[model samples]
Target: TLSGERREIIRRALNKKILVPNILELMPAWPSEFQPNIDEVNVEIDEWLKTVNVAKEKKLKHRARGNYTLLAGIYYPHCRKEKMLALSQFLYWIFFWDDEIDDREGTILCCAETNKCINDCLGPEPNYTPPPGSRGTVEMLYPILRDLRAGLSPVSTMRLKQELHDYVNGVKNQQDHLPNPWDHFQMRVDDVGVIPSITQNEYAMDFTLPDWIRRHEAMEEIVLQCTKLTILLNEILSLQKEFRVSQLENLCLLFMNTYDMSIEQSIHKVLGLLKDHYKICIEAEARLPWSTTDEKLNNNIREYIRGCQRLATGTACWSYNCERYFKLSQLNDQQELLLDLSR
Candidate 1:
């Protein structure tokens, strides 16, 4: 746990920034289902972990219960029940896999194998063969791939594959401390792997996003803004957890290293950046292409764009409340778990 004075210093530093009390208010009204089914999602997570051999990995203690809950909150609200369940399962697997990777050395080599398994799983034949004495990432991914195969459209599937590839390659950049904030933030966005894939959720659920429109510069700008915003919030929320690993992969650390600022100052600077980018996100939304003559299709496009905004706000909300990333309410419990883990 952080010292009381240090924690208070962080609180004050963050408090000084003009934080958005509700980022969602800037967007259209959210659906009624835009909420987390915490209990159900946690139950599903426990079951899915067992199926993935989490119990066999005796050294693994952090279940990331809060992360799964937050993911459910962020995504489930916008999906059908079946799609929601599949996404929740995917969330549990990805975060659990990332944590496992972070805990080990040889991050690049580790991720190489992990990425290969993911590739095979998402491949046409689903030939996900786990190497002997491997981390079982392939083994765990088998079922999730099955679920996604049945649900995701061909384009959505391709988008996910490319995003996963970008994410694995991007982690190699985090192998050491980045030289500056620009490269650091760019790598962070890539590592998040949500850039185009997360925005394609509507399409994955069978909504048509025409290829030309999706490829247009205006749409690309909105996607870029949302991706950057999401990563900024994520970096802030995961600082303590990342700090435990002695990792300097976050923006705050980049600021401290490049600008020679104190941790508090770096955090404040990062917060300012977050607020600034959020404003850009709002501005970019206004510039999205909504010119289709088909009223229904245009409305769907607008809704899809709003879906992107919802993803950003939903992630920020989840980060603020999730105990896995932040020690808001379960401070002692989270600290003890963090210590028990070898990372």
Candidate 2:
């Protein structure tokens, strides 16, 4: 809980910024049929269900009424791929409270840390702790939580086995040969930073940190690059969201200004224009993955470029479909329109 003044301050700061909200993580509940070993984790599932029902009956109403913490409000704006998963996982676990398929405390604390800085900046520590009987899903997970001071260890045997699988063979059926089935949300440390609107420069290059603060001989250049990437990733996404929204608004204005024009004609023209702009932006992103100073980060950028391409194409398809429907009504009523006949 934050002080009244502090809450207001936090809100004001966030309100000025254009926040990109990520919802990829808010997935539907994991189907019971999907679990490889459901019988062994049945008890865990029951406990998880109780937790879910309580939150739905409680948190939703509270948050809805605006009585939640400022940190909670702040968490809504920034777009992070992991945060989305973390959010879904938290929502899924807090309400659902599973011991086997997911670690309740692990899910809970990570959710807390997702807004760790914002919470700490406001007031009363809104940190999380795992409920009892929760054990580590793997050696890494238990230790990670232990270090975080978040809660108890993972309790289910299924957790231990899954961890071992991730450790030995990596996440199964994943694109990478890594262990554990967790999605890596930190896509390219700079994806958030590369936008022109956030940086002083139209390019992300100007977003670099000061040389004095980045003066570490062991990682002199690398450290500086990391700092720049971190700052830029957030900036880029924020700008992209703002830019896209502005484009849409402008199209609407055009539609409004041309009231005499056929709505169908306006829709086709604007949709085509937006598709062109979207294509250009997507093409620009292809160079992003290869633009980094770090090798691993560079690779992640490549992955992001692929992801963005999918999104760009998808957006175009949606606009095209929408225009098609709008055009259909006008074409069907072409000569029989009463608005023109009245004039």
TM-score of 2: 0.27
Task: Give me the overall lDDT of model 2.
Answer: 0.27
Per-residue alpha-carbon lDDT of candidate 2 for residues 1-343, written as tens digits (9 for 90 to 100): 2244333322322223221212111111101111122222333433433444344554344333222122111222222222222222222322222223224554455333322322232224432343343332221133222222222122212222232232222211121121111112233222221221111110111123222322324223332232332222222222223223332122222243334333344434434443344334434443332433776555434333322222322222222222211222322222211111010
Regions of candidate 2 where Cα sits further than 4 Å from its true position: 1-126, 129-254, 257-260, 286-295, 310-343
lDDT of all the models against the reference?
0.60, 0.27
Best by TM-score: 1
Per-prediction TM-score to the true structure, in the order listed: 0.76, 0.27
Compare the candidates by lDDT and give the number of the best one: 1
For candidate 2, the 10 contiguous residues with the lowest summed lDDT are 24-33
